[PDB]
Amino acid sequence: GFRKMAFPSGKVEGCMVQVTCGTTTLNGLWLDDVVYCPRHVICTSEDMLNPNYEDLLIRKSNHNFLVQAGNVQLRVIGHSMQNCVLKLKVDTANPKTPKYKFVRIQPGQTFSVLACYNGSPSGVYQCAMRPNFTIKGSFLNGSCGSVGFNIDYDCVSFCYMHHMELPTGVHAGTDLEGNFYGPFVDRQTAQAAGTDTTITVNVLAWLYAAVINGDRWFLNRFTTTLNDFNLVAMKYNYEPLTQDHVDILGPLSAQTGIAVLDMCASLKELLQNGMNGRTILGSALLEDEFTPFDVVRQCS
Amino acid sequence: GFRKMAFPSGKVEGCMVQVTCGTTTLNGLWLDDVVYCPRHVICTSEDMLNPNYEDLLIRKSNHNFLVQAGNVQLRVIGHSMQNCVLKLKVDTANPKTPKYKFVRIQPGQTFSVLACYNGSPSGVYQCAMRPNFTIKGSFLNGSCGSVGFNIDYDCVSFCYMHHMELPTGVHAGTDLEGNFYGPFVDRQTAQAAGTDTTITVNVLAWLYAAVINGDRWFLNRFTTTLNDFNLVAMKYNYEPLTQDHVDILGPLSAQTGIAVLDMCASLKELLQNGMNGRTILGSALLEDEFTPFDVVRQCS
Ligand SMILES: *[C@@H](O)[C@H](C[C@@H]1CCNC1=O)NC(=O)[C@H](CC(C)C)NC(=O)OC[C@H]1CC[C@H](CCC)CC1
Ligand SMILES: *[C@@H](O)[C@H](C[C@@H]1CCNC1=O)NC(=O)[C@H](CC(C)C)NC(=O)OC[C@H]1CC[C@H](CCC)CC1
Numbered sequence: 001g002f003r004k005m006a007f008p009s010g011k012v013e014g015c016m017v018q019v020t021c022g023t024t025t026l027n028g029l030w031l032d033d034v035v036y037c038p039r040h041v042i043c044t045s046e047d048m049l050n051p052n053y054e055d056l057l058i059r060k061s062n063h064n065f066l067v068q069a070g071n072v073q074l075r076v077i078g079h080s081m082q083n084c085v086l087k088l089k090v091d092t093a094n095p096k097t098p099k100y101k102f103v104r105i106q107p108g109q110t111f112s113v114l115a116c117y118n119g120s121p122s123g124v125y126q127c128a129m130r131p132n133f134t135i136k137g138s139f140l141n142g143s144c145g146s147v148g149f150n151i152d153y154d155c156v157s158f159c160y161m162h163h164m165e166l167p168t169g170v171h172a173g174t175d176l177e178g179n180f181y182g183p184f185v186d187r188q189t190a191q192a193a194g195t196d197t198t199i200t201v202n203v204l205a206w207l208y209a210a211v212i213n214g215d216r217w218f219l220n221r222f223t224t225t226l227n228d229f230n231l232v233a234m235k236y237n238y239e240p241l242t243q244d245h246v247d248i249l250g251p252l253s254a255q256t257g258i259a260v261l262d263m264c265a266s267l268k269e270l271l272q273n274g275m276n277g278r279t280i281l282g283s284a285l286l287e288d289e290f291t292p293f294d295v296v297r298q299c300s
Numbered sequence: 301g302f303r304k305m306a307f308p309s310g311k312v313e314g315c316m317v318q319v320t321c322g323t324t325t326l327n328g329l330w331l332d333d334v335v336y337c338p339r340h341v342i343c344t345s346e347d348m349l350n351p352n353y354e355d356l357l358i359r360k361s362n363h364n365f366l367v368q369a370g371n372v373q374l375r376v377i378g379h380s381m382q383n384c385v386l387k388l389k390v391d392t393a394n395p396k397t398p399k400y401k402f403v404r405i406q407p408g409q410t411f412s413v414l415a416c417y418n419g420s421p422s423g424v425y426q427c428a429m430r431p432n433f434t435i436k437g438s439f440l441n442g443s444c445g446s447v448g449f450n451i452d453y454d455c456v457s458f459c460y461m462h463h464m465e466l467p468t469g470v471h472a473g474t475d476l477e478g479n480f481y482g483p484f485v486d487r488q489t490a491q492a493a494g495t496d497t498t499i500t501v502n503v504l505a506w507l508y509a510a511v512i513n514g515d516r517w518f519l520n521r522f523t524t525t526l527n528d529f530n531l532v533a534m535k536y537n538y539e540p541l542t543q544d545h546v547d548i549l550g551p552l553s554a555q556t557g558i559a560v561l562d563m564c565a566s567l568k569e570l571l572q573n574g575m576n577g578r579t580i581l582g583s584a585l586l587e588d589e590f591t592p593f594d595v596v597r598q599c600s
Contacts, residue, residue, distance in 0.1 A: 006425065
């Protein structure tokens with residue numbers, strides 16, 4: 001009774017366009033009279049290993065960017081590069097522009113990805129921005145320019161634009177100002193994300209979700225302290241749990257009648273003992289890509 | 301690099317309305333000049349255990365159904381009951397009606413759910429129609445009338461409308477002609493689905509997805525036969541694998557260079573030996589809610 005759920009994608013579907021330079025095609029985001037896309041649309045295959053984007057872009061004029069919205073060509077009347085994104089000014093405001101903002105999301109928070117190819121939406125799924133500033137997505141060639149977002153009220157908060165894949169199979173990208181999350185650069189070389197630490201506060205939120213939904217076998221008669229819990233967290237590359245995290249879990253704690261430090265004692269035992277072939281909310285691993293807010297929103 | 305992915309929901313978002321009878325509110329699906337909704341909208345709380353729907357509906361007139369599309373009231377000008385759904389004729393065709401059909405989906409196939417409350421979309425996620433004709437969803441009070449669908453071309457194939465929850469926490473509902481999937485009836489009593497068998501062909505498809513995405517530790521030096529594999533399948537409440545299933549897996553077999561019966565030999569060993577703390581595509585359990593088509597569509 002608890003699922004990984006994406007936001008409804010309609011408001012974002014109406015913003016997706018196709019951008020082509022030469023033989024390179026990817027997706028763009030069309031808001032008001034600007035189309036945002038990854039700057040490596042200007043690269044050929046001989047450019048992708050070590051591109052000099054400033055030099056490559058000087059050779060491009062407005063008419064070298066083909067922007068297609070459905071079957072309709074948009075006229076590009078200006079272009080500029082901002083960090084790792086291009087802004088193509090077009091002669092038509094997108095009539096479907098929703099209320100929106102650009103946000104740079106914090107590690108540990110979640111968002112929905114609308115995967116797109118050739119300017120056409122393909123599917124939607126939820127991701128977390130991991131502590132090492134990667135995401136575990138599903139992206140193929142042609143998917144760059146697909147965006148991540150949250151919806152709050154009628155307002156779309158765009159937080160991610162897709163650019164690349166890492167050797168480990170995870171994904172990296174930018175905010176909508178073109179600044180990468182994490183240490184990555186948009187060149188087609190092997191890059192490291194570092195240790196992929198687990199989002200402790202989210203695992204605890206998901207354990208609360210399990211209790212709400214009737215899965216309680218892992219609850220024990222013990223409690224612990226924050227410092228004692230963190231000694232075990234460290235060994236498993238879990239984020240240190242802070243008092244701020246404990247405060248964020250307060251509402252779930254009161255809803256279930258299970259103190260945060262009692263749930264930490266249960267998590268400690270799960271980390272050290274495993275699940276002994278049992279499952280929690282249909283999973284045999286501890287899930288860390290639901291925030292406390294995600295759990296409350298879903299269970300309400 | 302492989303995710304549970306729902307279809308983009310925009311085309312369906314535009315069809316969702318709110319239907320109220322008395323104090324009972326749920327969602328309706330507005331296509332052309334008809335609104336489809338679960339018939340238990342006519343029930344009060346004293347009716348839900350053993351409703352006589354024919355007798356309850358005779359007491360209702362067109363003006364007792366309040367249909368709200370956004371902030372706009374629709375005028376109900378006819379009503380009728382078809383199996384477990386009501387069809388409310390309204391005086392306005394939905395201008396956002398997509399190209400659509402109604403399909404009754406086969407067990408083992410997948411679809412996207414647009415979860416809705418008060419006629420407003422809340423989130424989207426993928427489900428399989430399980431062999432015992434239940435789905436593992438996320439639904440609360442107020443969610444009935446939410447629909448499941450596939451998108452093929454520009455055409456929306458509606459296959460599911462949500463009605464109820466079972467004691468085991470799984471979910472049951474109807475096609476858009478109002479006929480339940482499975483043995484269930486729309487009354488608020490404990491009902492059994494029977495043994496929840498695993499969709500063998502889908503597990504094999506997902507193992508092929510894992511190979512495509514670089515996860516190959518479970519491949520062994522053995523092969524097997526269909527009859528020998530099924531002797532082990534039976535013990536684990538797996539669907540018998542048929543030659544028709546083997547044929548459906550043909551394209552994934554050729555894409556990976558792993559014969560179907562070689563992959564069955566790997567699955568056999570996983571079933572008998574477990575995963576020994578290892579994971580496949582980020583899971584510590586064998587996943588059966590991706591069809592062969594889902595895998596091909598995603599990996600393309
Ligand atoms: C969108 O244009 C595209 C999306 C990629 C393709 C495959 N999966 C994705 O998410 N992005 C790219 O092709 C970028 C473009 C450069 C200029 C940033 N290239 C990319 O993602 O490279 C993939 C790397 C994988 C790891 C490999 C080293 C392995 C030892 C090098 C390339
Ligand atoms: C939509 O109206 C609503 C959705 C339910 C509510 C909770 N989760 C859901 O999916 N459907 C209902 O309230 C139906 C209405 C009847 C008339 C079909 N009722 C329902 O789903 O009942 C839940 C059952 C759970 C198991 C319980 C027995 C446990 C020993 C009985 C009720």
